[PDB]
Amino acid sequence: PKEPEQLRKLFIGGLSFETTDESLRSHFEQWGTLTDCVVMRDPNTKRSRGFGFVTYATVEEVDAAMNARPHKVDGRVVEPKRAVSHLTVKKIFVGGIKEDTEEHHLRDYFEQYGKIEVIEIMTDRGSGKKRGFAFVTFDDHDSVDKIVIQKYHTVNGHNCEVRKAL
Ligand SMILES: CS(=O)(=O)N1CCC[C@@H]1CN
């Protein structure tokens, strides 16, 4: 029961024009089995378009590669990102938390996706009452990318709606 291929791909931007299918594969095979690895090139000149993609056998292998950033590939720091579900942001909206969800609930849950920098539990401008949603800001976009492709998020017993923010 393999994870969907779309969830096992990493788009690699910022490639050296010298990077090849073979050299990109040799690099990223350090973090797992690669079922696909392509450098995008011009159809007429064969000159590199400066980006490519690798497909791992499992999602855990994608995580391993992302946790090994920064990647310097053939002398150039590249920019890996998970495939589109790119709106590259570090902040999420968390809705459906009602009035009893506190900072530590959100922190304890979301800290396993990435390093948290800000947690903002929203309150009513007039009364101070909790409005039932929050924003979490991480230090890096991959946390958010992992979060928003999950079907479900359960925090403080609530089934929450989570999406990318601004
Ligand atoms: C992640 S990487 O393979 O590009 N690279 C950067 C420094 C550590 C490692 C070299 N072994």
From Swiss-Prot:
RRM domain location is 8-85, 90-166
Listed under GO cellular component are: catalytic step 2 spliceosome; cytoplasm; cytosol; extracellular exosome; membrane; nucleoplasm; nucleus; ribonucleoprotein complex
Q: Where is this region: Globular B domain?
A: 86-166
**Globular A domain: annotated span:** 1-85
UniProt modification remark:
Sumoylated.
Q: Which GO terms describe its molecular function?
A: DNA binding; G-rich strand telomeric DNA binding; identical protein binding; miRNA binding; pre-mRNA binding; protein domain specific binding; RNA binding; single-stranded DNA binding
**Source organism's superkingdom?**
Eukaryota
Which biological process terms from the Gene Ontology are attached to this UniProt entry? alternative mRNA splicing, via spliceosome; cellular response to glucose starvation; cellular response to sodium arsenite; import into nucleus; mRNA splicing, via spliceosome; mRNA transport; negative regulation of telomere maintenance via telomerase; nuclear export
Keywords associated with the record: Acetylation, Amyotrophic lateral sclerosis, Cytoplasm, Disease variant, Host-virus interaction, Isopeptide bond, Methylation, mRNA processing, mRNA splicing, mRNA transport, Neurodegeneration, Nucleus, Phosphoprotein, Repeat, Ribonucleoprotein, RNA-binding, Spliceosome, Transport, Ubl conjugation
Q: Give the modified residues of type Phosphoserine.
A: S16
Where does the record say this protein resides?
Nucleus; Cytoplasm
Q: Where do we see the Glycyl lysine isopeptide (Lys-Gly) (interchain with G-Cter in SUMO2) cross-link in this protein?
A: K2, K72, K164
Covalent crosslink: Glycyl lysine isopeptide (Lys-Gly) (interchain with G-Cter in SUMO): K98
Record function comment: Involved in the packaging of pre-mRNA into hnRNP particles, transport of poly(A) mRNA from the nucleus to the cytoplasm and modulation of splice site selection. Plays a role in the splicing of pyruvate kinase PKM by binding repressively to sequences flanking PKM exon 9, inhibiting exon 9 inclusion and resulting in exon 10 inclusion and production of the PKM M2 isoform. Binds to the IRES and thereby inhibits the translation of the apoptosis protease activating factor APAF1. May bind to specific miRNA hairpins.
**The protein's assembly and partners:** Identified in the spliceosome C complex. Identified in a IGF2BP1-dependent mRNP granule complex containing untranslated mRNAs. Interacts with SEPT6. Interacts with C9orf72. Interacts with KHDRBS1. Interacts with UBQLN2. Interacts with PPIA/CYPA. Interacts (via the RGG-box) with the HOXB-AS3 peptide; the interaction inhibits binding of HNRNPA1 to the intronic sequences flanking exon 9 of the PKM gene, preventing inclusion of exon 9 and promoting inclusion of exon 10 which suppresses formation of the PKM M2 isoform and promotes production of the M1 isoform.
Disease per record: Inclusion body myopathy with early-onset Paget disease with or without frontotemporal dementia 3: An autosomal dominant disease characterized by disabling muscle weakness clinically resembling to limb girdle muscular dystrophy, osteolytic bone lesions consistent with Paget disease, and premature frontotemporal dementia. Clinical features show incomplete penetrance. Amyotrophic lateral sclerosis 20: A neurodegenerative disorder affecting upper motor neurons in the brain and lower motor neurons in the brain stem and spinal cord, resulting in fatal paralysis. Sensory abnormalities are absent. The pathologic hallmarks of the disease include pallor of the corticospinal tract due to loss of motor neurons, presence of ubiquitin-positive inclusions within surviving motor neurons, and deposition of pathologic aggregates. The etiology of amyotrophic lateral sclerosis is likely to be multifactorial, involving both genetic and environmental factors.
Q: How is this protein named in the record?
A: Heterogeneous nuclear ribonucleoprotein A1
Organism in which the protein naturally occurs = Homo sapiens (Human)
